[PDB]
Amino acid sequence: LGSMKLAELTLESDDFITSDKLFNFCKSTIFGAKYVKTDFIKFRQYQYIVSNCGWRDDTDVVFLENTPVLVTGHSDYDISEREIDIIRLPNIRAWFCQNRNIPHPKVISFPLGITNKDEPNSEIHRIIGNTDRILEVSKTPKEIKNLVYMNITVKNFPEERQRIVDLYSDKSWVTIGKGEVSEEGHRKFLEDMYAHKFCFAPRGNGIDTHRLWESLYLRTIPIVKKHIAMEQFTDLPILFVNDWENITEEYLNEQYDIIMAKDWNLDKLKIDYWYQKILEY
Ligand SMILES: O=c1ccn([C@@H]2O[C@H](COP(=O)(O)OP(=O)(O)O[C@H]3OC[C@@H](O)[C@H](O)[C@H]3O)[C@@H](O)[C@H]2O)c(=O)[nH]1
Ligand SMILES: [Ca+2]
Ligand SMILES: [Ca+2]
Ligand SMILES: [Mg+2]
Ligand SMILES: [Mg+2]
Ligand SMILES: [Mg+2]
Ligand SMILES: [Mg+2]
Ligand SMILES: [Mg+2]
Ligand SMILES: [Mg+2]
Ligand SMILES: [Mg+2]
Ligand SMILES: [Mg+2]
Protein backbone atom coordinates (compact mmCIF):
# COMPACT_ATOMS: atom_id res chain seq x y z
CA LEU A 1 0.00 0.00 0.00
CA GLY A 2 2.69 2.52 1.17
CA SER A 3 5.37 1.52 -1.44
CA MET A 4 7.63 4.29 -2.75
CA LYS A 5 10.56 5.21 -5.00
CA LEU A 6 14.17 4.35 -3.96
CA ALA A 7 15.12 8.11 -3.96
CA GLU A 8 12.27 8.79 -1.40
CA LEU A 9 13.82 6.37 1.22
CA THR A 10 14.19 7.96 4.72
CA LEU A 11 15.89 6.12 7.66
CA GLU A 12 15.87 6.47 11.48
CA SER A 13 18.82 5.09 13.57
CA ASP A 14 16.94 1.84 14.61
CA ASP A 15 15.56 0.98 11.07
CA PHE A 16 18.73 -0.98 10.04
CA ILE A 17 18.38 -4.81 9.77
CA THR A 18 21.08 -6.87 11.57
CA SER A 19 20.91 -10.59 12.61
CA ASP A 20 21.65 -9.47 16.26
CA LYS A 21 18.35 -7.46 16.31
CA LEU A 22 16.34 -10.61 15.25
CA PHE A 23 18.31 -12.86 17.70
CA ASN A 24 17.76 -10.18 20.43
CA PHE A 25 14.01 -9.92 19.46
CA CYS A 26 13.64 -13.76 19.80
CA LYS A 27 15.35 -13.81 23.30
CA SER A 28 11.90 -12.70 24.70
CA THR A 29 10.18 -16.18 24.68
CA ILE A 30 6.81 -14.25 24.86
CA PHE A 31 7.11 -13.93 20.99
CA GLY A 32 7.41 -17.77 20.56
CA ALA A 33 10.39 -17.81 18.10
CA LYS A 34 13.68 -19.77 18.66
CA TYR A 35 16.93 -18.41 17.08
CA VAL A 36 19.58 -21.10 16.22
CA LYS A 37 23.00 -20.35 14.60
CA THR A 38 22.90 -22.36 11.29
CA ASP A 39 26.10 -24.39 12.15
CA PHE A 40 24.03 -26.26 14.85
CA ILE A 41 21.45 -27.22 12.12
CA LYS A 42 24.10 -28.40 9.56
CA PHE A 43 26.18 -30.46 12.11
CA ARG A 44 23.17 -31.62 14.26
CA GLN A 45 23.98 -34.97 16.02
CA TYR A 46 20.18 -35.63 16.39
CA GLN A 47 17.57 -35.43 13.57
CA TYR A 48 15.22 -33.06 15.54
CA ILE A 49 17.32 -31.97 18.63
CA VAL A 50 19.77 -28.99 18.36
CA SER A 51 21.43 -26.41 20.70
CA ASN A 52 23.41 -23.13 20.32
CA CYS A 53 25.82 -25.01 22.71
CA GLY A 54 26.81 -21.77 24.55
CA TRP A 55 26.80 -19.48 21.45
CA ARG A 56 25.59 -16.04 22.78
CA ASP A 57 25.63 -17.90 26.21
CA ASP A 58 22.55 -19.96 25.00
CA THR A 59 22.85 -23.64 26.17
CA ASP A 60 19.07 -24.44 25.88
CA VAL A 61 18.41 -27.78 24.08
CA VAL A 62 15.81 -27.09 21.29
CA PHE A 63 13.22 -29.84 20.47
CA LEU A 64 12.35 -28.85 16.85
CA GLU A 65 9.24 -31.15 17.05
CA ASN A 66 7.80 -28.63 19.66
CA THR A 67 9.15 -25.40 17.94
CA PRO A 68 6.42 -23.36 16.12
CA VAL A 69 8.81 -20.65 14.67
CA LEU A 70 12.52 -21.37 13.84
CA VAL A 71 14.95 -18.50 12.85
CA THR A 72 18.55 -19.27 11.63
CA GLY A 73 21.47 -16.91 10.77
CA HIS A 74 24.94 -15.66 11.89
CA SER A 75 26.41 -18.14 9.30
CA ASP A 76 27.40 -18.33 5.58
CA TYR A 77 25.57 -21.74 5.54
CA ASP A 78 22.29 -22.12 3.56
CA ILE A 79 18.98 -23.96 4.25
CA SER A 80 18.78 -26.67 1.49
CA GLU A 81 17.30 -30.17 0.71
CA ARG A 82 19.60 -31.48 3.56
CA GLU A 83 17.11 -29.81 6.04
CA ILE A 84 13.88 -31.16 4.33
CA ASP A 85 13.27 -33.56 7.32
CA ILE A 86 13.10 -30.51 9.73
CA ILE A 87 10.99 -28.40 7.26
CA ARG A 88 8.42 -31.31 7.02
CA LEU A 89 7.78 -31.11 10.85
CA PRO A 90 3.99 -30.39 10.91
CA ASN A 91 4.45 -28.32 14.16
CA ILE A 92 6.82 -25.76 12.44
CA ARG A 93 4.59 -22.91 11.10
CA ALA A 94 7.55 -20.95 9.56
CA TRP A 95 11.39 -21.08 9.18
CA PHE A 96 12.88 -17.52 8.92
CA CYS A 97 16.48 -17.89 7.55
CA GLN A 98 19.46 -16.16 5.90
CA ASN A 99 20.58 -17.89 2.63
CA ARG A 100 17.31 -19.72 1.65
CA ASN A 101 18.48 -22.44 -0.85
CA ILE A 102 15.27 -24.58 -1.22
CA PRO A 103 11.99 -23.52 -2.95
CA HIS A 104 9.71 -24.34 0.08
CA PRO A 105 6.83 -22.01 1.14
CA LYS A 106 7.49 -22.70 4.90
CA VAL A 107 11.09 -21.31 4.50
CA ILE A 108 10.97 -17.43 4.56
CA SER A 109 14.12 -15.40 3.57
CA PHE A 110 15.15 -12.41 5.74
CA PRO A 111 17.83 -9.87 4.70
CA LEU A 112 21.43 -10.43 5.98
CA GLY A 113 21.43 -6.62 6.45
CA ILE A 114 24.40 -4.86 8.14
CA THR A 115 27.35 -6.42 10.10
CA ASN A 116 26.57 -6.95 13.85
CA LYS A 117 28.59 -4.14 15.60
CA ASP A 118 28.11 -5.78 19.08
CA GLU A 119 29.84 -9.09 18.02
CA PRO A 120 31.78 -9.45 21.32
CA ASN A 121 35.45 -8.27 21.20
CA SER A 122 35.89 -7.85 17.37
CA GLU A 123 37.45 -4.65 15.83
CA ILE A 124 36.28 -5.46 12.20
CA HIS A 125 32.64 -5.92 13.49
CA ARG A 126 32.89 -2.65 15.54
CA ILE A 127 34.00 -0.75 12.34
CA ILE A 128 31.87 -2.12 9.40
CA GLY A 129 28.85 -2.62 11.78
CA ASN A 130 28.59 1.20 12.36
CA THR A 131 24.98 1.94 11.15
CA ASP A 132 25.36 5.59 12.43
CA ARG A 133 27.94 6.18 9.60
CA ILE A 134 25.40 4.72 7.05
CA LEU A 135 22.61 7.02 8.42
CA GLU A 136 25.11 10.00 8.39
CA VAL A 137 26.08 9.47 4.67
CA SER A 138 22.39 8.82 3.65
CA LYS A 139 21.46 12.42 4.79
CA THR A 140 24.29 14.23 2.85
CA PRO A 141 23.52 15.55 -0.68
CA LYS A 142 23.70 12.54 -3.10
CA GLU A 143 26.08 13.86 -5.86
CA ILE A 144 26.70 11.16 -8.57
CA LYS A 145 30.42 10.77 -9.57
CA ASN A 146 29.85 7.75 -11.93
CA LEU A 147 27.47 4.93 -13.05
CA VAL A 148 28.79 1.81 -11.15
CA TYR A 149 31.05 1.37 -8.06
CA MET A 150 33.32 -1.68 -7.86
CA ASN A 151 34.86 -2.63 -4.51
CA ILE A 152 34.73 -6.43 -3.86
CA THR A 153 37.10 -9.05 -2.37
CA VAL A 154 37.41 -11.42 -5.42
CA LYS A 155 38.86 -14.32 -3.32
CA ASN A 156 35.47 -14.77 -1.47
CA PHE A 157 33.62 -16.12 -4.63
CA PRO A 158 35.92 -15.82 -7.70
CA GLU A 159 33.75 -17.72 -10.29
CA GLU A 160 31.50 -14.56 -10.25
CA ARG A 161 33.79 -11.87 -8.68
CA GLN A 162 36.84 -12.54 -10.98
CA ARG A 163 34.63 -12.05 -14.12
CA ILE A 164 33.43 -8.62 -12.75
CA VAL A 165 37.01 -7.34 -12.09
CA ASP A 166 38.37 -8.78 -15.43
CA LEU A 167 35.48 -7.45 -17.65
CA TYR A 168 34.68 -4.02 -16.11
CA SER A 169 37.80 -2.68 -14.21
CA ASP A 170 38.95 -0.47 -17.18
CA LYS A 171 35.48 1.07 -18.03
CA SER A 172 35.14 4.93 -17.88
CA TRP A 173 31.64 4.35 -16.31
CA VAL A 174 33.16 2.15 -13.49
CA THR A 175 34.87 3.56 -10.33
CA ILE A 176 37.23 1.06 -8.57
CA GLY A 177 37.54 1.26 -4.75
CA LYS A 178 40.59 -0.27 -2.95
CA GLY A 179 39.55 -2.53 -0.01
CA GLU A 180 40.24 -0.73 3.34
CA VAL A 181 38.38 -1.77 6.57
CA SER A 182 39.64 1.08 8.87
CA GLU A 183 37.04 3.57 10.33
CA GLU A 184 38.13 6.05 7.55
CA GLY A 185 38.19 3.25 4.88
CA HIS A 186 34.60 2.24 5.88
CA ARG A 187 33.40 5.92 5.72
CA LYS A 188 35.15 6.24 2.27
CA PHE A 189 33.46 2.97 1.09
CA LEU A 190 29.95 4.29 2.08
CA GLU A 191 30.60 7.81 0.56
CA ASP A 192 31.88 6.16 -2.71
CA MET A 193 28.82 3.89 -2.82
CA TYR A 194 26.48 6.82 -2.15
CA ALA A 195 28.06 8.72 -5.13
CA HIS A 196 27.10 5.93 -7.66
CA LYS A 197 23.74 4.92 -9.27
CA PHE A 198 24.75 1.20 -9.08
CA CYS A 199 27.30 -1.03 -7.32
CA PHE A 200 28.43 -4.60 -8.16
CA ALA A 201 26.97 -6.69 -5.26
CA PRO A 202 27.96 -10.28 -6.27
CA ARG A 203 27.45 -13.16 -3.75
CA GLY A 204 30.41 -14.12 -1.48
CA ASN A 205 31.18 -17.23 0.63
CA GLY A 206 27.54 -16.80 1.75
CA ILE A 207 24.91 -16.16 -1.00
CA ASP A 208 23.49 -13.04 0.77
CA THR A 209 26.00 -10.15 1.20
CA HIS A 210 26.13 -7.03 3.51
CA ARG A 211 27.01 -4.89 0.39
CA LEU A 212 23.51 -5.60 -1.12
CA TRP A 213 21.78 -3.93 1.90
CA GLU A 214 24.48 -1.20 2.39
CA SER A 215 23.78 -0.19 -1.29
CA LEU A 216 19.93 0.00 -0.76
CA TYR A 217 20.26 2.03 2.54
CA LEU A 218 22.37 4.57 0.49
CA ARG A 219 19.67 4.60 -2.31
CA THR A 220 22.20 2.94 -4.74
CA ILE A 221 20.99 -0.01 -6.95
CA PRO A 222 22.95 -3.23 -6.18
CA ILE A 223 23.62 -5.58 -9.19
CA VAL A 224 23.13 -9.23 -8.01
CA LYS A 225 23.12 -12.59 -9.91
CA LYS A 226 19.67 -14.33 -9.84
CA HIS A 227 19.50 -17.05 -7.10
CA ILE A 228 16.58 -18.76 -5.21
CA ALA A 229 18.10 -17.09 -2.06
CA MET A 230 17.20 -13.72 -3.61
CA GLU A 231 13.81 -14.67 -5.08
CA GLN A 232 11.69 -13.13 -2.20
CA PHE A 233 13.47 -9.69 -2.58
CA THR A 234 12.13 -8.99 -6.17
CA ASP A 235 9.92 -6.19 -4.62
CA LEU A 236 13.16 -4.25 -3.74
CA PRO A 237 15.05 -2.15 -6.36
CA ILE A 238 17.80 -4.81 -6.98
CA LEU A 239 19.03 -5.27 -10.59
CA PHE A 240 18.94 -9.12 -10.92
CA VAL A 241 21.21 -10.47 -13.74
CA ASN A 242 21.31 -13.94 -15.43
CA ASP A 243 25.16 -13.66 -15.68
CA TRP A 244 27.98 -11.03 -15.46
CA GLU A 245 28.61 -10.75 -19.26
CA ASN A 246 27.60 -7.84 -21.59
CA ILE A 247 26.87 -5.18 -18.90
CA THR A 248 27.07 -1.91 -20.97
CA GLU A 249 26.57 1.81 -20.12
CA GLU A 250 23.40 1.74 -22.35
CA TYR A 251 22.09 -1.40 -20.49
CA LEU A 252 22.60 0.27 -17.03
CA ASN A 253 21.24 3.69 -18.23
CA GLU A 254 17.99 1.92 -19.33
CA GLN A 255 17.73 -0.20 -16.10
CA TYR A 256 18.36 3.00 -13.98
CA ASP A 257 15.38 4.76 -15.73
CA ILE A 258 13.04 1.70 -15.24
CA ILE A 259 14.05 1.01 -11.56
CA MET A 260 13.98 4.65 -10.42
CA ALA A 261 10.52 5.11 -11.99
CA LYS A 262 8.88 2.12 -10.14
CA ASP A 263 7.47 1.96 -6.55
CA TRP A 264 9.15 -0.65 -4.26
CA ASN A 265 8.26 -2.33 -0.90
CA LEU A 266 11.04 -0.31 0.89
CA ASP A 267 9.53 -1.12 4.38
CA LYS A 268 11.26 -4.56 3.87
CA LEU A 269 14.57 -2.60 4.49
CA LYS A 270 13.33 -1.72 8.07
CA ILE A 271 13.63 -4.22 11.00
CA ASP A 272 10.04 -3.40 12.26
CA TYR A 273 8.75 -5.18 9.06
CA TRP A 274 10.49 -8.46 10.16
CA TYR A 275 9.46 -8.05 13.87
CA GLN A 276 5.79 -7.78 12.65
CA LYS A 277 6.36 -10.70 10.17
CA ILE A 278 7.51 -12.97 13.09
CA LEU A 279 4.80 -11.51 15.46
CA GLU A 280 2.19 -12.80 12.88
CA TYR A 281 3.05 -16.28 14.40
O1 LIG B 1 36.66 -0.51 1.15
C1 LIG B 1 35.89 -1.26 1.74
C2 LIG B 1 35.33 -2.48 1.25
C3 LIG B 1 34.49 -3.19 2.02
N1 LIG B 1 34.13 -2.80 3.29
C4 LIG B 1 33.21 -3.61 4.12
O2 LIG B 1 33.53 -4.98 3.92
C5 LIG B 1 32.29 -5.72 3.77
C6 LIG B 1 32.55 -7.07 3.14
O3 LIG B 1 33.11 -6.89 1.81
P1 LIG B 1 33.88 -8.12 1.13
O4 LIG B 1 33.73 -8.06 -0.36
O5 LIG B 1 35.28 -8.20 1.67
O6 LIG B 1 33.06 -9.36 1.71
P2 LIG B 1 31.92 -10.28 1.08
O7 LIG B 1 30.91 -9.37 0.46
O8 LIG B 1 32.54 -11.34 0.24
O9 LIG B 1 31.33 -10.94 2.41
C7 LIG B 1 30.22 -10.50 3.14
O10 LIG B 1 29.01 -10.95 2.56
C8 LIG B 1 28.96 -12.38 2.44
C9 LIG B 1 29.06 -13.05 3.79
O11 LIG B 1 29.09 -14.47 3.62
C10 LIG B 1 30.32 -12.59 4.51
O12 LIG B 1 30.37 -13.11 5.84
C11 LIG B 1 30.35 -11.07 4.56
O13 LIG B 1 31.56 -10.61 5.15
C12 LIG B 1 31.43 -4.73 2.98
O14 LIG B 1 30.05 -5.08 3.00
C13 LIG B 1 31.73 -3.44 3.76
O15 LIG B 1 30.95 -3.35 4.93
C14 LIG B 1 34.63 -1.63 3.84
O16 LIG B 1 34.34 -1.23 4.95
N2 LIG B 1 35.48 -0.92 3.02
CA1 LIG C 1 37.92 -4.36 -6.54
CA1 LIG D 1 24.34 -10.79 -19.55
MG1 LIG E 1 15.96 -36.89 16.53
MG1 LIG F 1 22.88 -19.12 7.65
MG1 LIG G 1 19.98 -19.45 7.85
MG1 LIG H 1 30.31 -9.67 9.35
MG1 LIG I 1 32.19 -11.20 8.13
MG1 LIG J 1 30.94 -2.85 -5.56
MG1 LIG K 1 23.67 -14.03 -6.28
MG1 LIG L 1 23.89 -3.41 -24.40
Numbering used by the authors: -2 to 278
List passages from the publication reporting this PDB structure:
The density map of UDP‐α‐D‐Xyl identified the sugar donor in a well‐defined pocket where Asn148 coordinates the uracil moiety, and Arg208 and Arg158 coordinate the phosphate groups. Among the 17 well‐defined direct hydrogen bonds with 1, there are four H‐bonds between A075L and the nucleoside moiety and three specific H‐bonds with the Xyl moiety. Thus, A075L recognizes 1 with very high specificity. First, a double mutant (N148A, R208A), targeting those enzyme residues involved in the interaction with the ribose, the bases, and the phosphate moieties of the donor, was analyzed. In contrast, significant STD signals were observed for the acceptor 6. These results provide support for the proposal that the side chains of Asn148 and Arg208 are key for the binding of the donor, but do not affect the binding of the trisaccharide acceptor. Introduction of point mutations such as N148A and R208A affect the binding of the UDP‐xylose donor, but not the recognition of the acceptors. To understand the details of the glycosyl transfer mechanism, the geometries of A075L in complex with the donor and acceptor were initially superimposed. However, inspection of the superimposed structures showed that the distance between O4 Fuc and C1 Xyl exceeded 3.0 Å, too far for the nucleophilic attack. Additionally, it was deduced that the orientation of the UDP‐α‐D‐Xyl donor with respect to the Fuc moiety in the acceptor was not the proper one for the nucleophilic attack to take place. Hence, we hypothesized that a conformational rearrangement takes place for catalysis to occur.
Protein A075L is a β‐xylosyltransferase that participates in producing the core of the N‐glycans found in VP54, the major viral capsid protein of Paramecium bursaria chlorella virus‐1 (PBCV‐1). The protein structure shows a typical GT‐B folding, with two Rossmann‐like fold domains, in which the acceptor substrate binds to the N‐terminal region, and the nucleotide‐sugar donor binds to the C‐terminal region. We propose that the catalytic mechanism follows a direct displacement SN2‐like reaction, where Asp73 serves as a catalytic base that deprotonates the incoming nucleophile of the acceptor, facilitating direct displacement of the UDP with the inversion of the anomeric configuration of the acceptor without metal ion dependence, while the interactions with side chains of Arg158 and Arg208 stabilize the developing negative charge. In this context, we herein present the structural and biochemical characterization of A075L, a soluble chlorovirus xylosyltransferase easily produced in E. coli and amenable to large‐scale purification.
